[PDB]
Design a binder for this molecule. Structure first.
Ligand SMILES: COc1ccc(N2CCN(c3cccc(C)c3)CC2)nn1
Ligand SMILES: COc1ccc(N2CCN(c3cccc(C)c3)CC2)nn1
Ligand SMILES: COc1ccc(N2CCN(c3cccc(C)c3)CC2)nn1
Lengths: 238, 253, 283, 19, 238, 238, 283, 283, 19, 19, 19, 19
């Protein structure tokens, strides 16, 4: 018959290939597929929903919930600093986040990102923080002035309550690596006081702010790979 | 309406009460076609003189009765004309009509399951590879079982009912063409059945195509004098009988 | 056709319409089963049903997906010998074609009186190494209808197959698998029989009278070897393009002997699948 | 892909159809 | 020739595959196929024919025929109960039945089912039973009232003789398993006296009722598998 | 290339398969095929030519020629019998015959058959035999009357000389087996005297009849298989 | 389609337009996340963006390239024995189908509540030679749904597969790989469950109630051999033609037991991936 | 064509019409067989026939399905030697092409005088291990017409096949199978002959004069090895595109010698298939 | 090359498409 | 499927036809 | 014979062309 | 079947033709 030549790759097996295989039980009319509210079609979707950020990434706090709140304090001094985290989306505190947890399934990431903060303060309470995105290039800023110099957003706490800070995409390589890499260093984001936290009489003087991160329509990932954030130093029983 | 009338030869049967009638596999018995045929000779087809209403030997319905069967190609090995043409020819083909009569009163209680069965290979009563004997699957008008006694030396079938004699839970037997005789509504049972067999015309002697069974399901129960006997009578009519492969004549056995 | 056949939606079942109440004369729920017929009553008749558009196919409920499945019907075995090669009735097998010699499958068919079909085959030699090296072991499976020279021993002259079929399989090459018509002779395979060989009160009677599709003889070519072996060339059979006439009750009692229907243990007061209840009142 | 009875005889063919 | 790649599955063997194989004896014109009255094409057909039910599933009775009849008795009390069986079509007494015997060839079942009962009583005799289908959810009812509350059919014994009870399909999962499963529990069906069994003079006072089960056009099965109801603790000789 | 799946049967070898194989010496223009009187195309042809029958299948006769003649004798008695053979075309005396020899190459046979007889008597001689075909069902007839009852042909010896007796096809199974089988028993054919063998003066009183068998257009065979009638309990030398 | 599908440009992401400054009233950067909804703010909103025509596809970010990848879910093992062949529960394996019995993959799914898909399979027998020669070793992998005769030991009668599926692989021939529908029964595979067997204060509760797709029994044909062996027929599974509804948080703590969600080490005061910081002030 | 060819209904036999009685002059049953011709009488003539529409094909009764079947015609054998490799007339075979050297098939043809056909071939090496390991054993089957250097021993120079055909088979790779025309020379293969070499009262006479299609030499490459072997490369032959002229009586007596017709046992007072009867009167 | 569902059943086919 | 004489020569081909 | 990208992805294909 | 130069280069092809 057809003079054929069997090619090199032939007979192999790849955990990543698109090929057909004979059924196993022919003529099986599977159960119909009823209608079910909420079906996904793209990881992306999940990536665009803001999940909460562990940031109070500190000691005893960590195994608890607090590990999520950031109390905005006193501050005797002025123009003092709140916190910082680095943008490299696979870096505790980030990592664990619905996003992070994910990204860690792919080798490369890209686009803008969104950080949102909420005031679990009081009503009569007031404040004004300055948040900033310090692109890759230098060291996480020691001072506000130094950080205010780049990308930022002044946040006026008020009747609203949620300020969303965007993290533009600044990079040389259209794409960044999800894995820790000195090169693909995305930078830092930090928060400082613009004014203070003023509270009229008989209101607490510390209060919390929750923070979150969802994606931007910018966003996109690639090169699927097995995760980081989960070592099954098992096995698993029965 | 239940009343029924049937006319087959020079013979007719009536029934002032009945449970419809049944046509085996919804096919009406008829004569062989030059398509499915195979033989080459012109078949003799005794009409009327042959395919008529022969009635067998009657039987008693006991509170100890267990069941009785007749094998058709065989039950009429004596019934005039048909049963001669059987013996004179190699190939025989024919369909039947089974009229099962069994009356008693409306004060009686009983139930008979009647069924016909294509290729009813019975099982021997004895363990092994020894098949039932000829001479015992060839009873005749008289039929077999009753609840009888016999030599175990004979490569004797299973007198065993519940297993269907073939070892299939009777009750699934309802798969074969059938009906009952519930003495409270019924009077008879009427089965009509075409010719079923992988061959156009078989040996009327070696092979019995249809096998008929009647089995007491709910035991006869009166409150009368056991002077009151309630027989069971079977009547049969070859239909569209056709024969061929004429010659000497076999022999009785 | 495609969609319907790929989606497997060929034989679909009706849906359950909607009902309302009935305070009416004709009672469909009442019929007399003595007529031997089967009732025709439905959900919609008995209750106040709703409306369900169905979507279940009776595709897999076809004599072809019920029957069309490969099944062990025989396990040819050859405990080779090197001491005496050839000799009479050795190192070559010959089994009688036809089921029975194997359960499961046998039971399946038996569900019907007659039947007919082209049979697809598949061999599965399994070479067990009883030596420190087998290597190359050729095989010859040669079919043989009736009136045919059945090899007395290995190297007869019947293994020339000048006009017979012999399939050859050499360790490595995939599993041989061929087909086969409807053989027999007349119209269909006798799934039973109520006939005999003759009037001889010693004649045969059973589904072994209408089925004698010859025998199949094996034989392991390659000749004499050093390190021994034992082979077990399994056999599977599939029914493709099958047909069916008239059904019958399944077989609850474990069979006996080949051919035949016989039921009858070595005491086992006999046994069936039915379970016993303390009382009908509670299930 | 189908109806390509690569073999001559009819006995050799896939499982029949349904109708 | 044709640069080909041999795919993983290649060379295998499946007891469940549709592939062609060379004939063996070419040009064989098989015996013609004559006409034969009654040919099946679908298990279904067999499934729609009512086969008798072993229900008197009791001790010594069982190896005999009686194992099929249910005598309707005296009953000093009133509103008393007759029998019960559970619907799970692969459960003695059901199982063995042409249906059951079958269903046990597939992994999943569905649709409605039909139970039919017949009075092998007398003519002058009279009665009225109440049959009921107690859907899955609770325990087989101890009392009639409790059972009458769900699906049922009052049966008036009369000139007719056969009452057919339908078993609607009530389930969560479009489909049920044929194998014993706490989840896929189909429920129970039971029978009780509505009135009595009255017989005028010199008529027996016990009588039997036969019971049967055939399918509904509802019905359908799938996922063929090897049976339950038959262990060949053989072999088989010669 | 073409994602292919190697099917079970692959690599095997069948003494019965239609497949192509590369030539061996390309461009070989074989010797032309000249015209040659008498070429066959179907076994059938050979099967329709009457070959002679060994029937005098008796002792010392057998290794000689006589083994072919049947002398029609005296017969003091009347209505006496000549010979008999059975029809099962693979049964000495039949078998060895061009037909038989053949049929023994196939598993199944069918159709009508033709027996022809010839009078190697004298001219002035006269006779009348009765030949008969006794279909399958009973025993080869002991008496003429009994045999005359079925299929037969009275043969008037005269100026003609050859009477041909047909053997209709009577069977249940469209087809019969070529191999000895109680079932597929074709029957017997026998010959008897109708009158006598009268010879006027000084003419011998015994004479022979030759007998033959050719096929009918009815005829046909199938399921090729290796022969019966030839065991090479050799080998074969040089 | 092609190009778009070959070039893998099916799901493309929008580009980043150009912006200008805004000294205006409506503040898009301000929303109240308490609404439970998600913000909709973009680069273009917050900054003075430029103009970048994108070219990143969200193709590989599809439940089919996220799910559709083969993964070890089971490692059938058979330390053969020649001493006692057959015997009860020997030289033939039987594992319960369904994941969990393996990480990585398990974690992946669990990312969603429900789910549905046709499963593609692939076997990977690995014959370890513990002898001086193995040779030919046939294998039989036969699937078995619920209510089905599970082989008591090797050669039951259930290995006839008269109506079951058994795939056969002989040393040499490539890796078997078959597929399989969406089995189950209703609509989709329960990726979890908050139901029980019943009211029995001893009933079962978990994603093991809605999933009992029978078991699969192995078994190494070929029979008895000389030189021993041990087999390890790996198992990989791929989800083709998959679907998804409603998502959920990934699993950070190393699982426990099969089925179940349980977290709870043998002291390991419990442990998660989160790392500890000295101070929030420096990252 | 298809249907007719797939359904195998190419050569169909007539049907048996219906007859009536005949009290008429012309007697078809009477003919004089001395004319050497064959009678033409039929069912319909002799009896009162019915009407049977036939459906039997004479397809399988064609010189191509009668002849076109593979048959052992030779069994090349090589009991290797490692002691002396090469040497003269060793470890390489050379058999004379043409049947006879094998029964069954030989008998088949012989049914006809002349004949002609393209021959399809198939090899079936069978390596018997007489050692503790064979491994890789290449093979070279090289055909050789007349006037051609036939290897004196293994490694001649004739195994270069610079212009000859040599097929190579290495343990593993499937069975070689090639074809071949109608070779010979004139028109068809002499299935017999009544000629001689010449007038030399010592000349040859038989079907060995018109058929000398050279010889075929084997030889197992791979060279010298450790563990011995013995090979038996079987041979099968099939006739495709065959023709036939003039038929003749089959061969009842077991042959003798190659070529030739001779019958004549070592006493066996000679023997044929005919059986003996006690009496003609009873069969 | 594509859409050549060499196998009958649908469950057997390549990774679906995208839309 | 047929008449695809994958090979050049005629001697190489399937069993002929019938007519 | 050509342009039969038996595989989906583009990265898998023969050596490109020339122009 | 023919002219299906499965390979690109010309040096790779069957035995030429005749004319
Ligand atoms: C009663 O119906 C049957 C049942 C089985 C059967 N077989 C099928 C298998 N077959 C077969 C299978 C493998 C090899 C050979 C030579 C023959 C023999 C006939 N023939 N008829
Ligand atoms: C909960 O969803 C699942 C998850 C896994 C699963 N499997 C897939 C693999 N499968 C399988 C794989 C290989 C062999 C056999 C017999 C079955 C069993 C069911 N079924 N449903
Ligand atoms: C008398 O007719 C024949 C009969 C046989 C024959 N053969 C066929 C086989 N053949 C052949 C077969 C295999 C290998 C080689 C080299 C040649 C040689 C000629 N040639 N002519």
């Amino acid at each position: 018959g057809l003079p054929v030549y069997i090619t090199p790759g032939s007979g192999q097996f790849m955990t990543t290939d698109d090929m057909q295989s004979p059924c196993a039980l022919p003529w099986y009319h599977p159960t119909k597929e009823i209608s079910i509210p909420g079906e996904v079609k793209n990881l992306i979707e999940m990536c665009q929903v803001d999940t909460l950020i562990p940031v109070n990434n500190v000691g005893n706090n960590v195994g608890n919930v607090s590990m999520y709140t950031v109390q905005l304090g006193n501050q005797t001094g002025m123009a003092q600093k709140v916190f910082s985290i680095k943008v490299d989306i696979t870096s505790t505190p980030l990592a664990t986040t619905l996003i992070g947890e994910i990204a860690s399934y792919y080798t490369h990431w890209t686009g803008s990102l969104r950080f949102s903060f909420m005031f679990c303060g009081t009503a009569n309470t007031t404040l004004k923080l300055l948040l900033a995105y310090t692109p890759p290039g230098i060291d996480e800023p020691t001072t506000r002035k130094d950080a205010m110099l780049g990308t930022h957003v002044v946040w006026d706490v008020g009747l609203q309550s949620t300020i969303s800070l965007v993290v533009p995409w600044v990079s040389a390589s259209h794409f960044r690596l999800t894995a820790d890499n000195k090169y693909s260093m995305a930078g830092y984001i930090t928060c400082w006081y613009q004014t203070n936290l003023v509270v009229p009489p008989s209101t607490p003087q510390t209060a919390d702010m929750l923070c979150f991160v969802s994606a931007c329509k910018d966003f996109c990932l690639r090169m699927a790979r097995d995760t980081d954030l989960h070592i099954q130093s098992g096995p698993i029983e029965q | 309406d239940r009343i029924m009338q049937i006319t087959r030869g020079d013979s007719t049967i009536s029934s002032d009460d009945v449970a419809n009638a049944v046509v085996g596999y919804g096919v009406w018995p008829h004569y062989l076609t030059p398509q499915d045929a195979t033989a080459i000779n012109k078949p003799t087809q005794p009409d009327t003189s042959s395919n008529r209403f022969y009635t067998l030997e009657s039987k008693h319905w006991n509170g100890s009765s267990k069941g009785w069967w007749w094998k058709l190609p065989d039950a009429l090995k004596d019934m005039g004309i048909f049963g001669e043409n059987m013996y004179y020819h190699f190939l025989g083909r024919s369909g039947y009509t089974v009229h099962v009569q069994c009356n008693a009163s409306k004060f009686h209680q009983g139930t008979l399951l009647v069924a016909m069965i294509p290729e009813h290979q019975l099982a021997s009563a004895k363990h092994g590879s020894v098949t039932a004997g000829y001479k015992l699957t060839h009873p005749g008008e008289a039929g077999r079982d009753v609840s009888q006694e016999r030599d175990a030396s004979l490569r004797q079938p299973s007198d065993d009912s519940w297993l269907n004699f073939d070892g299939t839970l009777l009750g699934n037997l309802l798969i074969f063409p059938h009906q009952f005789i519930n003495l409270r509504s019924n009077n008879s049972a009427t089965l009509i059945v075409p010719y079923v067999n992988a061959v156009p015309m078989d040996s009327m002697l070696r092979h019995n195509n249809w096998c008929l069974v009647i089995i007491p399901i709910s035991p006869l129960r009166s409150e009368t004098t056991s002077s009151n006997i309630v027989p069971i009578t079977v009547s049969i009519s070859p239909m569209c009988a056709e024969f061929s492969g004429a010659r000497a004549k076999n022999i009785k056995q | 056709n495609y969609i319907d056949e790929v989606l497997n939606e060929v034989l679909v079942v009706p849906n359950i319409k909607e009902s309302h109440h009935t305070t009416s004369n004709s009672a469909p729920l009442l019929d007399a089963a003595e007529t031997g017929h089967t009732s025709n009553v439905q959900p919609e008749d008995a209750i106040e049903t709703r409306y369900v558009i169905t979507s279940q196919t009776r595709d897999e409920m076809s004599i072809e997906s019920f029957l069309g499945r490969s099944g062990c019907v025989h396990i040819s075995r050859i405990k080779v010998d090197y001491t005496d090669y050839n000799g009479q009735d050795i190192n070559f097998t010959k089994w009688k074609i036809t089921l029975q010699e194997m359960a499961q499958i046998r039971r399946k068919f038996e569900l019907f009186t007659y039947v007919r079909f082209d049979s697809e085959i598949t061999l599965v030699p399994c070479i067990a190494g009883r030596g420190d090296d087998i290597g190359h072991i050729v095989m010859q499976y040669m079919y043989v209808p009736p009136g045919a020279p059945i090899p007395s021993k290995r190297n007869d002259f019947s293994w020339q197959s000048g006009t017979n079929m012999s399939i050859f399989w050499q360790h490595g090459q995939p599993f041989p698998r061929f087909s086969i018509p409807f053989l027999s002779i007349a119209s269909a395979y006798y799934m039973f029989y109520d006939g005999y060989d003759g009037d001889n009160t010693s004649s045969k009677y059973g589904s072994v009278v209408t089925n004698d599709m010859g025998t199949i003889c094996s034989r392991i070519v390659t000749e004499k070897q050093k390190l021994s072996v034992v082979i077990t060339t399994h056999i599977y059979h599939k029914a493709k393009h099958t047909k069916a006439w008239c059904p019958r009750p399944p077989r609850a009692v474990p069979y006996t002997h080949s051919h035949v229907t016989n039921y009858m243990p070595e005491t086992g007061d006999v046994t069936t699948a039915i379970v016993r209840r303390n009382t009908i009142t509670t299930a | 892909y189908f109806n390509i009875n690569y073999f001559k005889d009819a006995a050799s063919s896939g499982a029949s159809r349904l109708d």
